[PDB]
Amino acid sequence: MFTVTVPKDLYVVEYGSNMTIECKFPVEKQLDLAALIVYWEMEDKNIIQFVHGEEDLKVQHSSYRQRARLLKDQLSLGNAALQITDVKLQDAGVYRCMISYGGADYKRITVKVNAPY
Amino acid sequence: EVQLQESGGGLVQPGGSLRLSCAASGFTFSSYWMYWLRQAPGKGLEWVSSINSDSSSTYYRDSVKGRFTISRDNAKNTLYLQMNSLKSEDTAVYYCAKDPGGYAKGQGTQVTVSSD
């Protein structure tokens, strides 16, 4: 059945680094962007809402504005890739990727941020 | 905590109609895209329909286009699915969700379409 997978679901990151965290979803031949819905959230925070081919920024959390991006060129490979730039200690926690592409599924990713120098 | 509760499920004959409702609380329902998902026994959870907060955009899985209509009342914090021309293949637990993965969804409402 349609399953979202996380071949890496643990990211131990240095403070102030950039990171890309990744969820896989099965794509047959050419991606239909109009059928795709990809959300990234963490705890009670909204990070990404990519809805039927277009990002919606209305409810995105202030802490993630300008730092959080979905890599659109990864979607056609069946890869939901969230880039966070300039990682903060408060970026530590459990992220979830929630995807509809015919089927519907989600997975959780653990992010740990090492203390700065 | 997010609170979602579906209602309006039932047993119907092929060609029949149901109106599902979804009451929402514990978040600002009126801000969010909302989704109908469904899961039949032994099968994966699947996407049925999407609607944006202002009801300007609606989307439907190919198999329900022209039969199912999504709507919402942002004052009543309620999401609707009008299901007409129901088919045996529509049998499933129907879920309202505030995300397309079914992370945050209700306990569901059973829709059964069968001649018996």
Short mmCIF file of C-alpha atoms in Angstrom, two decimals:
data_model
loop_
_atom_site.label_atom_id
_atom_site.label_comp_id
_atom_site.label_asym_id
_atom_site.label_seq_id
_atom_site.Cartn_x
_atom_site.Cartn_y
_atom_site.Cartn_z
CA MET A 1 0.00 0.00 0.00
CA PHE A 2 0.99 3.72 -0.39
CA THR A 3 3.59 4.22 2.41
CA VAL A 4 5.69 7.31 3.33
CA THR A 5 9.20 6.05 4.34
CA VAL A 6 12.13 7.65 6.26
CA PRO A 7 15.37 5.70 5.48
CA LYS A 8 17.00 8.24 7.88
CA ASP A 9 14.68 9.33 10.78
CA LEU A 10 17.42 10.69 13.16
CA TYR A 11 19.40 13.91 12.40
CA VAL A 12 22.00 15.04 15.01
CA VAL A 13 22.90 18.56 13.72
CA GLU A 14 25.44 21.27 14.81
CA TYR A 15 23.95 24.61 16.03
CA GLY A 16 23.82 27.18 13.16
CA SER A 17 24.25 24.48 10.42
CA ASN A 18 21.82 23.88 7.50
CA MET A 19 19.98 20.50 7.25
CA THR A 20 17.67 18.72 4.77
CA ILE A 21 15.31 16.08 6.31
CA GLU A 22 13.64 13.71 3.83
CA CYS A 23 10.46 11.55 3.54
CA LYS A 24 10.01 9.24 0.50
CA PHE A 25 6.63 8.58 -1.21
CA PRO A 26 6.09 6.33 -4.26
CA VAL A 27 5.77 8.18 -7.63
CA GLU A 28 4.88 6.28 -10.88
CA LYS A 29 6.43 7.97 -13.99
CA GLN A 30 5.72 11.77 -14.07
CA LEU A 31 4.59 13.44 -10.78
CA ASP A 32 1.07 15.00 -10.93
CA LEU A 33 1.77 18.19 -8.85
CA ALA A 34 -2.03 18.97 -8.81
CA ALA A 35 -2.69 15.64 -6.92
CA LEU A 36 0.17 16.19 -4.37
CA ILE A 37 -0.35 17.53 -0.79
CA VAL A 38 2.82 17.75 1.43
CA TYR A 39 2.78 19.17 5.02
CA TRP A 40 5.73 19.55 7.40
CA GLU A 41 4.89 20.29 11.06
CA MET A 42 6.70 19.82 14.40
CA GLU A 43 4.84 19.72 17.77
CA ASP A 44 2.04 22.40 17.40
CA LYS A 45 4.03 24.44 14.77
CA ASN A 46 3.15 24.80 11.03
CA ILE A 47 6.31 24.68 8.81
CA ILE A 48 5.25 23.75 5.20
CA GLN A 49 1.78 23.52 3.56
CA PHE A 50 2.27 22.57 -0.14
CA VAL A 51 -1.31 22.03 -1.42
CA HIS A 52 -2.19 20.78 -4.96
CA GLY A 53 0.98 22.26 -6.58
CA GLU A 54 1.43 25.57 -4.62
CA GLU A 55 2.82 26.50 -1.15
CA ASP A 56 0.38 28.29 1.24
CA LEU A 57 2.28 30.48 3.80
CA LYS A 58 -0.80 31.80 5.76
CA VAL A 59 -0.39 29.67 9.00
CA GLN A 60 3.45 29.10 8.83
CA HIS A 61 5.08 29.64 12.30
CA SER A 62 7.20 32.87 12.66
CA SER A 63 10.27 30.86 13.86
CA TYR A 64 10.40 29.03 10.44
CA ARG A 65 9.74 32.05 8.08
CA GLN A 66 12.55 32.40 5.43
CA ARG A 67 14.49 29.45 7.06
CA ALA A 68 12.12 26.59 5.99
CA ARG A 69 11.83 25.50 2.29
CA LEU A 70 10.41 22.41 0.52
CA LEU A 71 12.85 21.43 -2.28
CA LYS A 72 10.39 21.42 -5.24
CA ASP A 73 12.96 19.72 -7.61
CA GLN A 74 13.01 16.66 -5.20
CA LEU A 75 9.18 16.09 -5.41
CA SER A 76 9.36 14.54 -8.97
CA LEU A 77 11.76 11.90 -7.41
CA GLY A 78 9.10 11.03 -4.75
CA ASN A 79 11.15 12.86 -2.09
CA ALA A 80 9.55 15.38 0.33
CA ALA A 81 12.72 17.30 1.38
CA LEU A 82 12.51 20.05 4.06
CA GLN A 83 15.54 22.40 4.17
CA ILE A 84 16.07 24.34 7.46
CA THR A 85 18.88 26.99 7.29
CA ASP A 86 20.71 28.42 10.38
CA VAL A 87 19.46 25.66 12.76
CA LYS A 88 18.51 26.86 16.32
CA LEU A 89 18.51 24.86 19.62
CA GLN A 90 14.66 25.35 19.52
CA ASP A 91 14.63 23.50 16.10
CA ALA A 92 15.30 20.28 18.14
CA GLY A 93 12.25 17.95 18.29
CA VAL A 94 10.05 15.49 16.38
CA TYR A 95 9.14 16.61 12.82
CA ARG A 96 6.27 14.99 10.87
CA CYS A 97 5.86 14.76 7.07
CA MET A 98 2.19 14.25 6.06
CA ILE A 99 1.59 13.41 2.37
CA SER A 100 -1.45 12.72 0.16
CA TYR A 101 -0.63 11.40 -3.36
CA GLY A 102 -3.66 9.15 -3.93
CA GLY A 103 -2.92 7.32 -0.66
CA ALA A 104 -2.39 9.21 2.65
CA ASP A 105 0.40 8.54 5.21
CA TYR A 106 2.87 10.29 7.55
CA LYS A 107 6.20 9.59 9.31
CA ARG A 108 8.08 11.25 12.22
CA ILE A 109 11.77 12.40 12.19
CA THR A 110 13.87 13.14 15.34
CA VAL A 111 16.12 16.26 15.14
CA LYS A 112 18.76 16.82 17.89
CA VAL A 113 20.84 20.06 17.95
CA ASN A 114 24.35 19.88 19.55
CA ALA A 115 25.39 22.84 21.80
CA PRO A 116 27.27 25.68 20.01
CA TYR A 117 31.04 26.44 20.48
CA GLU B 1 -5.58 19.41 21.80
CA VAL B 2 -7.11 19.16 18.26
CA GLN B 3 -10.68 17.71 18.39
CA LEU B 4 -12.28 16.25 15.20
CA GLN B 5 -15.47 14.10 15.27
CA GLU B 6 -17.15 12.74 12.09
CA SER B 7 -20.88 11.88 11.85
CA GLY B 8 -23.49 10.95 9.19
CA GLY B 9 -22.14 7.48 8.22
CA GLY B 10 -24.63 4.64 7.55
CA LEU B 11 -25.58 1.53 5.50
CA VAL B 12 -26.97 2.51 2.02
CA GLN B 13 -27.80 0.67 -1.28
CA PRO B 14 -25.63 1.35 -4.39
CA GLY B 15 -26.84 4.67 -5.96
CA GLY B 16 -27.71 6.01 -2.48
CA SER B 17 -26.73 9.27 -0.69
CA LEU B 18 -25.14 10.20 2.68
CA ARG B 19 -24.13 13.61 4.11
CA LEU B 20 -21.03 13.36 6.37
CA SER B 21 -20.36 16.12 8.92
CA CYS B 22 -17.15 16.84 10.88
CA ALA B 23 -17.22 19.04 14.04
CA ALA B 24 -13.81 20.69 14.80
CA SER B 25 -12.41 22.27 18.02
CA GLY B 26 -9.06 22.82 19.83
CA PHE B 27 -7.65 24.70 16.77
CA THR B 28 -8.68 27.71 14.56
CA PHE B 29 -10.63 25.54 12.03
CA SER B 30 -11.49 28.76 10.04
CA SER B 31 -7.72 29.23 9.16
CA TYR B 32 -7.00 25.69 7.82
CA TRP B 33 -7.27 23.70 4.60
CA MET B 34 -9.39 20.63 5.52
CA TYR B 35 -9.44 17.08 4.06
CA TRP B 36 -11.68 13.99 3.76
CA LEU B 37 -9.66 10.71 3.91
CA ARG B 38 -11.02 7.13 3.90
CA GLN B 39 -9.77 3.58 4.72
CA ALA B 40 -11.44 0.22 3.81
CA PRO B 41 -10.51 -3.04 5.64
CA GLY B 42 -7.05 -4.40 4.56
CA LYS B 43 -6.35 -1.26 2.42
CA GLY B 44 -4.28 1.94 2.92
CA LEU B 45 -5.68 5.30 4.10
CA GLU B 46 -6.40 7.41 0.94
CA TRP B 47 -7.22 11.06 0.09
CA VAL B 48 -10.84 11.85 -1.01
CA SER B 49 -11.17 15.70 -1.07
CA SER B 50 -9.57 19.08 -0.04
CA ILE B 51 -11.09 22.56 0.61
CA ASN B 52 -9.27 25.85 1.49
CA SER B 53 -10.51 28.13 4.35
CA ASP B 54 -12.48 30.58 2.07
CA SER B 55 -14.04 27.70 -0.06
CA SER B 56 -12.55 29.22 -3.31
CA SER B 57 -10.72 25.90 -4.15
CA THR B 58 -11.95 22.25 -3.89
CA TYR B 59 -10.21 19.04 -5.12
CA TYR B 60 -11.51 15.41 -5.38
CA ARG B 61 -9.96 11.96 -6.04
CA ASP B 62 -10.77 10.91 -9.67
CA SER B 63 -13.11 8.07 -8.45
CA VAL B 64 -15.54 10.54 -6.65
CA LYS B 65 -15.51 13.56 -9.11
CA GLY B 66 -19.15 14.61 -9.88
CA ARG B 67 -20.58 12.39 -7.05
CA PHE B 68 -19.03 13.88 -3.82
CA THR B 69 -19.17 17.63 -2.86
CA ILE B 70 -16.97 19.11 -0.03
CA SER B 71 -18.11 22.30 1.80
CA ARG B 72 -17.51 23.95 5.21
CA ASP B 73 -19.14 26.33 7.72
CA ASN B 74 -16.31 28.35 9.39
CA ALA B 75 -18.87 29.84 11.89
CA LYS B 76 -20.10 26.32 12.92
CA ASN B 77 -16.50 24.87 12.74
CA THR B 78 -18.03 22.09 10.55
CA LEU B 79 -16.75 20.33 7.39
CA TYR B 80 -19.27 18.52 5.10
CA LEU B 81 -19.14 15.77 2.43
CA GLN B 82 -22.32 15.34 0.33
CA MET B 83 -21.95 11.80 -1.16
CA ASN B 84 -24.38 11.01 -4.05
CA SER B 85 -24.48 8.02 -6.51
CA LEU B 86 -22.67 5.86 -3.87
CA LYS B 87 -20.77 2.74 -5.13
CA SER B 88 -19.76 -0.53 -3.34
CA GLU B 89 -16.10 0.72 -3.78
CA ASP B 90 -16.94 3.77 -1.54
CA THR B 91 -17.35 1.43 1.54
CA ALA B 92 -14.82 2.59 4.23
CA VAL B 93 -14.34 4.52 7.50
CA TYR B 94 -14.38 8.25 6.44
CA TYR B 95 -12.09 10.70 8.28
CA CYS B 96 -11.89 14.50 8.39
CA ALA B 97 -8.24 15.66 8.86
CA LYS B 98 -6.38 19.01 9.22
CA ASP B 99 -3.36 17.39 7.45
CA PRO B 100 -3.13 15.19 4.32
CA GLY B 101 -1.31 12.32 6.19
CA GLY B 102 -4.17 11.58 8.66
CA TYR B 103 -1.88 12.54 11.61
CA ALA B 104 -4.70 14.76 13.08
CA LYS B 105 -8.10 13.21 12.12
CA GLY B 106 -11.31 12.07 13.90
CA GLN B 107 -12.23 8.54 15.12
CA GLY B 108 -14.10 8.23 11.75
CA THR B 109 -17.65 7.36 10.53
CA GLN B 110 -18.46 3.98 8.82
CA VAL B 111 -19.96 4.24 5.27
CA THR B 112 -21.25 0.84 3.96
CA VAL B 113 -22.69 0.59 0.37
CA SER B 114 -24.13 -2.95 -0.27
CA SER B 115 -27.26 -4.65 -1.79
CA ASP B 116 -27.18 -7.41 0.95
#
